[PDB]
From Swiss-Prot:
Keyword terms: Disulfide bond, Endonuclease, Glycation, Glycoprotein, Hydrolase, Lyase, Nuclease, Secreted, Signal
Top-level lineage group: Eukaryota
Residues annotated to bind substrate: K7, R10, K41, P42, V43, N44, T45, K66, R85
Parent sequence residues shown: 27 to 150 of 150
Tissue: Pancreas.
Protein name listed in UniProt: Ribonuclease pancreatic
UniProt-annotated glycosylation sites, renumbered to this chain: K1, K7, N34, K37, K41
Organism field: Bos taurus
Catalytic residues of the enzyme: H12, H119
Broad class of enzyme this protein falls into: lyase
Higher taxonomy: Eukaryota, Metazoa, Chordata, Craniata, Vertebrata
Length: 124
């Protein structure tokens, strides 16, 4: 059974220098990571850092999660990321995405023991 930490790696982890793909990165990535199987996931960020660097964020700046839980953490460093946002014309199961590359501070929710990223909350 897929753990929350494993699901965070599948949905958000793309360790590389930055986005690389043969075509539209977000279309290819959201499909291959199975983020378009039951619905078009409307917004999804990929993080192009090492897993260790992303896991380390669970000990960085504690911030309120958007839902009001208090187990969110903001990276001290900017981080190479790629935002995927569903287009207006995208309708499931023909999901389409616009790709936005950025360097931003990420905000993740962490849980468990070991305390590890389980949710991507925002970037700033
Ligand atoms: O900059 C951003 C903003 C958001 N995300 C997403 O990332 C996931 C985190 O991972 P998870 O394990 O958490 O996965 P899930 O992907 O199942 O989402 P959650 O259960 O956490 O709930 P939620 O945040 O309410 O999103 P939904 O996708 O259910 O739909 P809505 O946008 O509300 O549409 P609506 O207007 O009602 O039709 C989602 O929560 C969501 O935050 C990014 O990547 N980057």
């Amino acid at each position: 059974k897929e753990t929350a930490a494993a699901k965070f790696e599948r949905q958000h982890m793309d360790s590389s220098t930055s986005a690389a793909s043969s075509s539209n990165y977000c279309n290819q990535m959201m499909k291959s990571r199975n983020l378009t199987k039951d619905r078009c996931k409307p917004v999804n960020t990929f993080v192009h850092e090492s897993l260790a660097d992303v896991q380390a964020v669970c000990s960085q700046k504690n911030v309120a999660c958007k839902n009001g839980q208090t187990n969110c953490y903001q990276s001290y460093s900017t981080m190479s990321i790629t935002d995927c946002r569903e287009t207006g014309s995208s309708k499931y199961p023909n999901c389409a995405y616009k790709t936005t590359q950025a360097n931003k501070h990420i905000i993740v929710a962490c849980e468990g023991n070991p305390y590890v990223p389980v949710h991507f909350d925002a970037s700033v």
